[PDB]
């Protein structure tokens, strides 16, 4: 079993988003975290031959 750095970074973003749901603002930081999570998915899909 070999866990690549990409999955580790995605897990880190997962935890960051999970902890960031509760911060008190206009939703800015929560949206930032959510988008930074998804960006890993999109980038992965586009360069799927890497």
């Amino acid at each position: 079993k070999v866990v690549h750095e990409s999955l580790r970074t995605l897990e880190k973003a997962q935890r960051q988003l999970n902890a960031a749901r509760f911060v008190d603002d206009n939703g800015e930081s929560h949206y930032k975290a959510l988008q930074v999570l998804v960006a890993q998915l999109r980038d992965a899909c586009e360069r799927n031959r890497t």
Binding site: Y31, L34, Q35, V38, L41, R42, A44, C45, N48
Partner: peptide, 21 residues
């Protein structure tokens, strides 16, 4: 058996949030 299509579907679920933001 790559889940690329599933990942694409999951990402598209957040399109409404992106449009609203």
């Amino acid at each position: 058996h790559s889940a690329f299509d599933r990942a694409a579907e999951v990402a598209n679920s957040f399109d409404g949030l992106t449009e609203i933001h």
